[PDB]
Amino acid sequence: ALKTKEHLMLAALETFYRKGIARTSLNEIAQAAGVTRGALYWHFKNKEDLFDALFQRICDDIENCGSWTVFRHTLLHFFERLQSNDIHYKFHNILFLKCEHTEQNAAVIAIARKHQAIWREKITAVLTEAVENQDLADDLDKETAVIFIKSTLDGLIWRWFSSGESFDLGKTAPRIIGIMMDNLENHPCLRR
Amino acid sequence: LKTKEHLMLAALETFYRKGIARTSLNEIAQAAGVTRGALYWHFKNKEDLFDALFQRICDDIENCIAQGGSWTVFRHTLLHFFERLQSNDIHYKFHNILFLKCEHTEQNAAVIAIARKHQAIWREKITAVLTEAVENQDLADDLDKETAVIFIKSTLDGLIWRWFSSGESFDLGKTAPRIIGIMMDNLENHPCLRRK
């Protein structure tokens, strides 16, 4: 039963990746899945639900893989998987490059915003554990730190996709991550 | 030419409302209050209007950099970029369009090609700032210039993306100077940005 839901969302992933989210229709997804519109509707009422499910599959894969070191490993595995996992590659390609913030995509954008809030809470908890464990300074500005972490990671992703993958992500990401973590631990501009 | 600028801002406003892919030349002409023939005389297609907007953005930046040491000027230029991103409607709308309303589809392939040309321009300009800073001994002689440019663009693009994509939910005036100061400290001191 989970295989029928998976076939439809992967057909959605393929159509989104080719046409973008705004121009993708339910009929195209159903056609690409080789199913009827009614069969698609049985599992997913709309593009929002397909995109949201894609978000959950990405987050499930990440979570199914001390605390400050695990975070570092998680960031490194994330960028490796962007190069080796076709679903993670295409999903983030869609999110950053094929998902325009227009009124037409408002409900898809609302789903994306819900997942940004979730990443925010997960990073904030990582920082909290690192502070109590003395991996980070007691006067760390956690709010600025979260913005800093997300901006660093988003910049590398956006830059990699928008450049047409014109630089080696396997060599670049550990260096970007290493500088980021050094800044979080030591740079005074990230303190209250 | 004031007739050309009227057309470019009609394109900017329509791009900002509808996105680049869904905008048609007729809508731009209509919004500018001119005929399709009048528009085509100055701009053959959406790409060239987008290209002209890119140039106005670059002209604005260069006519302000024209106002000690080039490395300190670079700091000011970066700070001024994010300030006008928040205070100048043309710079706000254009970069909003670029990051959030310009999807990388086959339909937009020609627009994307224009953007790629201007990324190459920014890359060359950042490389020249880096070359000057090394020659002025503001940056180490063994700076990895290739990684540093990628590093600079990634830091700045990430902040812009984050600000727009979050719905401007944090204070850019207070956040960008911290980000810039850290970025420039890393370029000056961090060993990961060295060739060795």
Side-chain angles (χ1 to χ4, degrees), chain A residues 1 6-18 20-22 24-30 32-36 38-44 47-55 57-79 81-102 104-112 115-120 122-128 130-137 139-170 172-174 176-192, chain B residues 3-16 18-21 23-29 31-35 37-46 48-55 57-64 66 68-75 77-79 81-88 90-105 107-115 118-123 125-131 133-134 136-140 142-145 147-173 175-194:
Chain A
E6 178 187 21
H7 185 77
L8 304 175
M9 48 180 299
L10 290 179
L13 184 69
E14 298 295 339
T15 314
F16 290 164
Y17 176 71
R18 184 175 62 80
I21 292 182
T24 293
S25 77
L26 289 176
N27 283 311
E28 292 162 4
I29 296 167
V35 304
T36 70
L40 177 64
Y41 187 74
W42 166 259
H43 289 291
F44 299 100
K47 286 193 295 185
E48 299 76 351
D49 313 315
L50 283 158
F51 188 68
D52 196 2
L54 285 170
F55 244 125
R57 162 72 179 266
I58 296 300
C59 302
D60 292 350
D61 287 350
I62 291 170
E63 278 168 30
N64 292 337
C65 288
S67 174
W68 191 233
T69 284
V70 169
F71 184 58
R72 180 171 69 71
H73 289 161
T74 302
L75 299 178
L76 291 170
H77 204 184
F78 178 87
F79 285 95
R81 201 184 287 110
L82 210 55
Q83 280 170 309
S84 67
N85 184 317
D86 292 338
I87 289 177
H88 282 248
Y89 174 86
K90 287 177 179 119
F91 174 82
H92 292 97
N93 178 292
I94 288 158
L95 183 63
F96 280 79
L97 296 196
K98 296 174 186 165
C99 178
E100 60 191 357
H101 288 43
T102 66
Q104 180 184 7
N105 280 331
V108 165
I109 299 303
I111 298 294
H115 290 277
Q116 300 178 20
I118 286 171
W119 285 128
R120 192 170 103 78
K122 296 188 174 306
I123 295 166
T124 295
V126 167
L127 295 177
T128 302
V131 172
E132 52 84 9
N133 201 264
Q134 297 165 7
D135 292 317
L136 296 174
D139 67 336
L140 180 76
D141 186 353
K142 290 184 179 171
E143 192 57 28
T144 295
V146 174
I147 293 171
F148 177 81
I149 289 164
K150 289 191 174 193
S151 72
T152 303
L153 304 176
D154 291 340
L156 182 55
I157 301 163
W158 195 84
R159 184 89 235 116
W160 191 61
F161 283 126
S162 61
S163 80
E165 301 87 36
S166 68
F167 59 86
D168 188 347
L169 192 60
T172 303
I176 295 300
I177 292 162
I179 295 166
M180 194 194 80
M181 300 295 267
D182 281 337
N183 288 328
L184 290 156
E185 292 165 2
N186 303 310
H187 204 284
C189 289
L190 295 169
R191 305 293 174 85
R192 299 186 181 106
Chain B
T3 171
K4 205 162 185 241
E5 189 178 355
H6 188 79
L7 272 49
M8 293 178 23
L9 282 43
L12 180 69
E13 296 294 341
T14 311
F15 288 161
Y16 175 72
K18 297 184 64 61
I20 292 183
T23 294
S24 77
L25 287 174
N26 283 311
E27 292 161 3
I28 296 165
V34 310
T35 190
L39 174 61
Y40 182 67
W41 176 266
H42 291 292
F43 298 99
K44 51 188 189 176
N45 44 36
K46 281 193 294 186
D48 281 308
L49 279 156
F50 186 67
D51 197 1
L53 284 166
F54 242 134
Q55 266 304 319
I57 294 300
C58 301
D59 291 350
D60 287 349
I61 294 170
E62 299 170 354
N63 292 338
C64 288
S70 59
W71 188 235
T72 51
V73 174
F74 183 58
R75 180 180 171 274
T77 302
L78 297 177
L79 291 168
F81 178 88
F82 286 95
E83 294 172 348
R84 82 163 67 77
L85 206 56
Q86 205 174 350
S87 71
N88 182 316
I90 289 178
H91 281 250
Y92 176 87
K93 288 176 179 166
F94 175 83
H95 294 94
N96 175 289
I97 288 158
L98 181 61
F99 281 81
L100 296 196
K101 295 174 186 165
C102 176
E103 59 189 356
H104 288 222
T105 64
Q107 168 179 341
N108 278 330
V111 162
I112 298 303
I114 297 294
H118 290 278
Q119 299 177 18
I121 287 170
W122 284 128
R123 178 184 54 198
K125 287 188 175 192
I126 295 166
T127 294
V129 168
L130 294 178
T131 302
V134 172
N136 199 45
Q137 289 162 26
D138 289 314
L139 297 174
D142 70 335
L143 182 75
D144 186 353
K145 290 185 178 172
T147 296
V149 174
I150 295 170
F151 173 79
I152 291 164
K153 289 190 174 192
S154 178
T155 298
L156 304 176
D157 290 341
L159 182 53
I160 303 166
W161 169 269
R162 184 96 298 279
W163 192 62
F164 282 123
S165 170
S166 80
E168 299 92 36
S169 67
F170 58 98
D171 189 347
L172 190 58
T175 301
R178 299 195 205 195
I179 296 300
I180 290 161
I182 295 167
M183 191 193 70
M184 292 179 66
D185 281 341
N186 291 140
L187 288 155
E188 295 169 7
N189 307 133
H190 203 287
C192 285
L193 296 168
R194 303 294 172 85

